Design a protein around this nucleic acid. Structure first.
Ligand SMILES: [Mg+2]
Ligand SMILES: [Mg+2]
Ligand SMILES: [Mg+2]
Ligand SMILES: [Mg+2]
Ligand SMILES: [Mg+2]
Ligand SMILES: [Mg+2]
Ligand SMILES: [Mg+2]
Ligand SMILES: [Mg+2]
Ligand SMILES: [Mg+2]
Ligand SMILES: [Mg+2]
Ligand SMILES: [Mg+2]
Ligand SMILES: [Mg+2]
Ligand SMILES: [Mg+2]
Ligand SMILES: [Mg+2]
Ligand SMILES: [Mg+2]
Ligand SMILES: [Mg+2]
Ligand SMILES: [Mg+2]
Ligand SMILES: [Mg+2]
Ligand SMILES: [Mg+2]
Ligand SMILES: [Mg+2]
Ligand SMILES: [Mg+2]
Ligand SMILES: [Mg+2]
Ligand SMILES: [Mg+2]
Ligand SMILES: [Mg+2]
Ligand SMILES: [Mg+2]
Ligand SMILES: [Mg+2]
Ligand SMILES: [Mg+2]
Ligand SMILES: [Mg+2]
Ligand SMILES: [Mg+2]
Ligand SMILES: [Mg+2]
Ligand SMILES: [Mg+2]
Ligand SMILES: [Mg+2]
Ligand SMILES: [Mg+2]
Ligand SMILES: [Mg+2]
Ligand SMILES: [Mg+2]
Ligand SMILES: [Mg+2]
Ligand SMILES: [Mg+2]
Ligand SMILES: [Mg+2]
Ligand SMILES: [Mg+2]
Ligand SMILES: [Mg+2]
Ligand SMILES: [Mg+2]
Ligand SMILES: [Mg+2]
Ligand SMILES: [Mg+2]
Ligand SMILES: [Mg+2]
Ligand SMILES: [Mg+2]
Ligand SMILES: [Mg+2]
Ligand SMILES: [Mg+2]
Ligand SMILES: [Mg+2]
Ligand SMILES: [Mg+2]
Ligand SMILES: [Mg+2]
Ligand SMILES: [Mg+2]
Ligand SMILES: [Mg+2]
Ligand SMILES: [Mg+2]
Ligand SMILES: [Mg+2]
Ligand SMILES: [Mg+2]
Ligand SMILES: [Mg+2]
Ligand SMILES: [Mg+2]
Ligand SMILES: [Mg+2]
Ligand SMILES: [Mg+2]
Ligand SMILES: [Mg+2]
Ligand SMILES: [Mg+2]
Ligand SMILES: [Zn+2]
Lengths: 155, 206, 98, 127, 24, 60, 117
RNA sequence: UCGCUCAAACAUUAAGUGGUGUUGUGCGACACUUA
RNA sequence: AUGUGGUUUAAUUCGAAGCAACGCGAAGAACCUUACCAGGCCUUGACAUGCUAGGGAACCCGGGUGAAAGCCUGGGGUGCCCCGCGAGGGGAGCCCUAGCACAGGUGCUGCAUGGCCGUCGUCAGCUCGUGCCGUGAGGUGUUGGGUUAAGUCCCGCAACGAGCGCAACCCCCGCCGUUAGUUGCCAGCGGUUCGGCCGGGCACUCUAACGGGACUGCCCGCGAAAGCGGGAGGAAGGAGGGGACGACGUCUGGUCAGCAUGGCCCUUACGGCCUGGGCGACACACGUGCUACAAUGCCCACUACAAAGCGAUGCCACCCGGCAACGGGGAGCUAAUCGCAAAAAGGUGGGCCCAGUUCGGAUUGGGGUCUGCAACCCGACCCCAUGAAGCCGGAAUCGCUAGUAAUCGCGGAUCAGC
């Protein structure tokens, strides 16, 4: 809208751990409005986490989303009649959004049969430092430093 | 424009059914069917005295055909002959217990349908179409109303291109419910075609 | 023992005739359960406005068919005459059975 | 003795008859963990109980009817709240800020005419 | 498949029952 | 064929699969509600007038 | 009047807001419901907007006027300062004095000296 | 899998003109206008 | 699948033509609906008023030719009023034949029109009265500053008010009570068939009806005013969400096939009837949609949670035949208490194993059921078999700001059935 900034949708905190970031991930997983289905599907991977590594699903989730959090991105902009690919910092919310989002997609990219195992293995490679979603993050940051020339229009 | 019919708009709140009665889902049609042909026959051989609100009531063989008129002196004739033979022709083709409860009209100028049919006739009789609407609205406001509005439409006098003559005074908040504004439609036969008529009288409030 | 049905359209006219019966039966006989409103069976009719083609802006009405129930127990002779004479219905088709 | 409160959401009503005791919770017969199976919102409806610090100390009995499966849960959530607040004025001073006392006006709206789903309009075109 | 002329939801979508669908 | 058809609609000489619905008022060939026996057009016309008992403007 | 029972809080404050602004400007004009036999002013130039009205209505024109003024368009002139409470007071007092002196009961001038400082 | 010419069909237009855009044939490795 | 352009045909009826035509008129094309064609027939008519003349009770059955319409004909029959016991005569109701006036027309013209509708757009606008300025067209007001969803309000203002608009009064969902108790309650007690089935009760759920409530009302901060931001109480704050409501007008918009209608045109046929065919044609193109191209999944067994609606010539619980559609026996129902009804998705368990696949059901062969005079053209629905295109799709492009999108079932209108 042109008037107000429109405030963010303060979502319901986690119903098992107590953290808004986790529930937000469920929503991205949520296909056709099946929260309870996606919730379980998420907790399914949480148990696959303790199966592989003796690590808590909580910090394994934080480390994953953190290493896929895009620091800077290139945005298109007009100037007299031309489009420049200007790089610049992203908003904290958008970083969290894209991170959570890419991860879900990266799970879909995997050959893994079951959804939970896709999110499981992906959450490992993400927290590690190399995965389908992470590489899509490294990619976007490249574009930023590449066009660093056009960074003169910070706006 | 649009402007949904003001009567159908006040249908629930202000004015009540011009034809009030209950019916089962079994014969609602047949009831309203005959109910229709009645008011039609009245509009025909009764328009002489200038009828307006042809109110109707039914329940079980009983039908209160209350007919509001400018001057019932014509709907009764002399002593009781016009009105009597009217009940005759009524149940003559029907079967229900006809009960013509005629009632005068305190002021035809404050009764929209009358005001319309009145001026609408003036046009048919070839008259000053513009000022005819002016006097009509002036007649209603000076009469005692609190709002007036009249609109003809079609070949004014007889011009090729169509036209619509707008004229009104006072207030006519058609968007408000607590207004009680009587609607007054009317035809107008001319040797050159048709001609529409409208009339709005604001009176009630709260 | 006896049961009365008060079907009708306008609830304003249904409330006047339903309250009338409650005063006439109680004030001149045994006990009588007050007006019992039932699920109003409504006929919602949707349809288009313009005569020709206008699959939108359409207008729709609704047929409010109300229902009210009143039960009188002891068959009082005063209540039978009271309701037989002192009645003022109109568009209210009532039906009564034992 | 008992703690009563009214639950409702999406035309899914829910009486709440609570009696201090163990933790056995019956709702329209059956058990709580029995009726609600594989649903995380289940343990969420008991949130009012975790807020008061008395999870296992109350036998609940709720009559929830109509509405959907989850709409009932939200009806139970607000129902239990009115129940425990009925005999506790001080527990409203910590159940309200946590957000519990609201019918949740959020309800499905009428499918508008000309449209398809109260808002979603058919695919616009010009070809 | 909401279009299979021989399935559960196959008849559910067509508003019928038949064999594969329980009927009285 | 408008007049000859409204008359034939009330005839029902042969089988019943010819006694098709037919509006009473303006005698429309289609959009004839069975309850009212009228066409959608004249239906609305009367409804605004108030000549249709119990038929109020729907709003919800 | 005992008719305040109706009228919701809406019309109340609004109608009170009516009275407030109504008196805000009209207070001093409503006392007469006819066309003044004459007009008196503090600065013909500034309020010349009214002078025209009176002029076109043939209403005689009297007004105190400083150098910043238009003498010819005033019937009976009152030359002298105007942008000073001191000079305005001496004139208005003595002027209205002639009003009551031709009327009846010559009273003492209104408490102006205190307001001056 | 890319580069290129040409003749349809479709898309951008309010419409046309032209162009632009994809798939189809044979080879080498937006700008202008609208009795 | 459906509409449309186009082409084809004896006809493939007509209209709407960017947005604002194209699942639109159509909320029901097999004959009907039907407005197009072919053929067989009628031609004061199927229908309104009225007139001259012969005969006749108004009324009912059959026969020959035929697709039917119709064409030719034969038979049974004899009411009421005015004069008489009978005959005989005239009139009203109603008909055939002949004749006159006249009917009828989905034949033109939506730039002849009424009415009704779309549209910009619920957008924030458009005007009148007097006063004032200009020779005048016209201006001012409605401009300006702050604010608002808004010409909302405030302050200022040669302007001062008002009117048509906006808001508000109208209904649903939002908190609770008042009124009524055949909706519901092992909640509290007795029988338990351990089923609110019986007794009992209405506080509570519900069914509808009336009323209160939210008003920038409170405090803090900015402010001249109007007003904005933040916090509490509250079911709900700054219109709470949605609907009804869509101005002066524009689009010479649409509609003479909804209807009314001026004029033009036809009047043994541009009117009327039937049968059959045709809006359903296919080398092609576009719009709107359903269902998929699958492992957040496909086939299957068990279990659970809706709202609203409809139901006498209609909804169908229980029992039997068969694979089943479906049929038959047969109880209840003027319908909060009988039926359509399992809501689906979802919860537990099984096969499946990345394959044109247990995905996908389009196409085609044969055998059945339902409605209807009649399913070749041209209906729906079972069952067995054939198991197609089809790996989330180019240029382009649409919807949607929250209980919305997406996704999953249900009901009606229309209606013989579809
Ligand atoms: Mg006159
Ligand atoms: Mg909260
Ligand atoms: Mg919805
Ligand atoms: Mg709802
Ligand atoms: Mg709704
Ligand atoms: Mg699917
Ligand atoms: Mg069904
Ligand atoms: Mg069986
Ligand atoms: Mg008619
Ligand atoms: Mg003084
Ligand atoms: Mg190319
Ligand atoms: Mg070629
Ligand atoms: Mg070549
Ligand atoms: Mg090369
Ligand atoms: Mg160029
Ligand atoms: Mg040129
Ligand atoms: Mg065509
Ligand atoms: Mg035509
Ligand atoms: Mg056009
Ligand atoms: Mg011919
Ligand atoms: Mg005649
Ligand atoms: Mg004879
Ligand atoms: Mg005879
Ligand atoms: Mg024969
Ligand atoms: Mg004979
Ligand atoms: Mg005779
Ligand atoms: Mg003629
Ligand atoms: Mg037009
Ligand atoms: Mg028109
Ligand atoms: Mg046209
Ligand atoms: Mg002048
Ligand atoms: Mg001059
Ligand atoms: Mg002017
Ligand atoms: Mg202006
Ligand atoms: Mg009570
Ligand atoms: Mg109660
Ligand atoms: Mg205040
Ligand atoms: Mg105060
Ligand atoms: Mg302070
Ligand atoms: Mg204030
Ligand atoms: Mg204030
Ligand atoms: Mg708060
Ligand atoms: Mg309070
Ligand atoms: Mg506000
Ligand atoms: Mg409004
Ligand atoms: Mg015509
Ligand atoms: Mg005519
Ligand atoms: Mg000829
Ligand atoms: Mg159920
Ligand atoms: Mg309802
Ligand atoms: Mg049905
Ligand atoms: Mg059966
Ligand atoms: Mg019954
Ligand atoms: Mg059932
Ligand atoms: Mg499952
Ligand atoms: Mg297969
Ligand atoms: Mg198959
Ligand atoms: Mg067939
Ligand atoms: Mg995707
Ligand atoms: Mg390409
Ligand atoms: Mg049917
Ligand atoms: Zn009609």
């Amino acid at each position: 809208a042109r008037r107000r900034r429109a405030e963010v949708r303060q979502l319901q905190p986690d119903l098992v751990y107590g953290d808004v970031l986790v529930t937000a991930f469920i929503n991205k997983i949520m296909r056709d409005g099946k929260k309870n289905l996606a919730a379980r599907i998420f907790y399914d991977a949480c148990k696959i986490i303790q199966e592989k590594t003796g690590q808590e699903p909580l910090k394994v989730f934080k480390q994953a989303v953190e290493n896929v959090k895009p620091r800077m991105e290139v945005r298109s902009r007009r100037v007299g009649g031309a489009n420049y690919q200007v790089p610049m910092e992203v908003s904290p919310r958008r970083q969290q959004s894209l991170a959570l989002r890419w991860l879900v997609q990266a799970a879909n990219q995997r050959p893994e049969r079951r959804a939970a195992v896709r999110i499981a293995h992906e959450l490992m490679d993400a927290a590690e430092g190399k995965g389908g979603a992470v590489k899509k993050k490294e990619d976007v940051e490249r574009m930023a430093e590449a066009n660093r020339a056009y960074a003169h229009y910070r706006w | 424009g649009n402007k949904i019919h003001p009567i159908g708009f006040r249908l629930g709140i202000t004015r009540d059914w011009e034809s009030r009665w209950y019916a089962g889902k079994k014969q609602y049609r047949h009831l309203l069917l005959e109910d229709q042909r009645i008011r039609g026959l009245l509009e025909k051989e009764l328009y002489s005295a200038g009828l307006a609100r042809v109110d109707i009531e039914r329940a079980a063989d009983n039908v209160a055909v209350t007919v509001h008129v400018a001057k019932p002196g014509v709907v009764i004739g002399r002593g009781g002959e016009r009105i009597r033979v009217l009940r005759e022709e009524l149940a003559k083709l029907t079967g229900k217990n006809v009960a013509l409860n005629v009632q005068e009209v305190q002021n035809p100028n404050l009764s929209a349908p009358l005001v319309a049919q009145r001026v609408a006739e003036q046009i048919e009789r070839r008259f000053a179409v513009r000022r005819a609407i002016k006097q009509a609205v002036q007649r209603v406001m000076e009469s005692g109303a609190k709002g007036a509005k009249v609109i003809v439409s079609g070949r004014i006098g007889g011009a090729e291109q169509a036209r619509t003559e707008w004229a009104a005074q006072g207030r006519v908040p058609l968007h408000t419910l607590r207004a009680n504004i009587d609607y007054g439609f009317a035809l107008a036969r001319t040797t050159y075609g048709v001609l529409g008529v409208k009339a709005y009288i604001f009176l009630g409030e709260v | 023992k006896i049961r009365i049905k008060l079907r009708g359209f306008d609830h304003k006219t249904l409330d006047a005739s339903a309250q009338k019966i409650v005063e006439a039966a109680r004030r001149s006989g045994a006990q009588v359960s007050g007006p019992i409103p039932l699920p109003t069976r409504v006929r919602r009719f949707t349809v288009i406005r313009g005569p020709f083609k206008h699959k939108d802006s359409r207008e729709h009405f609704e047929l409010r068919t109300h229902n009210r129930l009143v039960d009188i127990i002891n068959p009082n002779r005063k209540t039978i005459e009271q309701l037989m004479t002192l009645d003022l219905p109109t568009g209210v088709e009532i039906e009564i059975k034992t | 003795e008992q703690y009563y409160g009214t639950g409702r959401r999406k035309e899914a009503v829910a009486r709440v008859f609570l009696r201090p005791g163990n933790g056995k919770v019956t709702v329209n017969g059956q058990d709580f963990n029995e009726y609600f199976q594989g649903l995380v919102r289940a343990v969420a409806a008991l949130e009012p109980l975790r807020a008061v610090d008395a999870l296992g100390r109350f036998d609940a009995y709720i009559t929830v009817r109509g509405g959907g499966k989850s709409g009932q849960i939200d009806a139970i959530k607000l129902g239990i709240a009115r129940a425990l607040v009925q005999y506790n004025p001080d527990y409203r001073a910590k159940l309200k800020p946590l957000g519990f006392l609201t019918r949740d006006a959020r309800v499905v709206e009428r499918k508008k005419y000309g449209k398809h789903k109260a808002r979603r309009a058919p695919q616009y075109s010009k070809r | 498949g909401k279009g299979d002329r021989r399935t559960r939801r196959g008849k559910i979508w067509r508003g019928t029952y038949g064999k594969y669908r329980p009927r009285k | 064929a408008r007049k000859a058809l409204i008359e034939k609609a009330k005839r029902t000489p042969k089988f019943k699969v010819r006694a098709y619905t037919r509006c009473v008022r303006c005698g429309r060939a289609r959009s004839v509600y069975r309850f009212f026996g009228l066409c959608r057009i004249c239906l609305r016309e009367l409804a605004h007038k108030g000549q249709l008992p119990g038929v109020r403007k729907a709003s919800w | 009047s005992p008719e305040i029972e109706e009228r919701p809080k809406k019309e109340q404050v609004r109608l009170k807001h009516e009275l407030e602004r109504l008196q805000k400007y009209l207070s001093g004009f409503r006392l007469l419901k006819r066309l003044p036999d004459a007009i008196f002013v503090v600065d013909p130039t500034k309020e010349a907007i009214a002078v025209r009205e009176a002029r076109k209505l043939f209403i005689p024109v009297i007004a105190l006027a400083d150098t910043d003024s238009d003498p010819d368009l005033v019937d009976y002139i009152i030359p002298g300062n105007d942008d000073a409470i001191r000079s305005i007071q001496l004139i208005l007092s003595r002027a209205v004095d002639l009003i009551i002196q031709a009327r009846g009961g010559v009273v003492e001038p209104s408490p102006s000296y205190a307001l001056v400082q």
